[PDB]
Design a protein around this ligand. Structure first.
Ligand SMILES: [Cu+2]
Length: 128
């Protein structure tokens, strides 16, 4: 929809899309995360995490170490533009962030930081 997108992650370790657009006229942008399938957060939880391409690797690796009770995300991470909670089949969440945070010349990627998931669960976000 407008200034918002709906994203799904499933039991197959797949987001429903690998590309998100943000109209530059938006002041705030909202990602609505959902989870088809039947599984639970502790073995197939997913989140939606947004950073620069260059920072993705560090966010994923620090998140893997941070544990489940921290959504597999290091607290107070300066590299994270936006994040949702970790959800499971039936659990759902949304995140809204400031479009001004998306700087020029920067390439952004969104991904899941549940351990090992980033290998398949990643994509790109850019301004339109
Ligand atoms: Cu995941």
């Amino acid at each position: 929809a407008e200034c918002s997108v709906d994203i799904q992650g499933n039991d197959q370790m797949q987001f429903n899309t690998n590309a998100i657009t943000v109209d530059k006229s938006c002041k705030q942008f909202t990602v609505n995360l959902s989870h088809p399938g039947n599984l639970p957060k502790n073995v197939m939880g997913h989140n939606f995490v947004l950073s620069t391409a260059a920072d993705m690797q560090g966010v994923v690796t620090d998140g893997m170490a941070s544990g489940l009770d921290k959504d597999f995300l290091k607290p107070d991470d300066s590299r994270v533009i936006a994040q949702t909670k970790l959800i499971g089949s039936g659990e759902k969440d949304s995140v809204t962030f400031d479009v001004s945070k998306l700087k020029e010349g920067e390439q952004f990627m969104f991904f899941c930081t549940f351990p090992g998931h980033s290998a398949l669960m990643f994509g790109w976000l850019h301004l339109k």
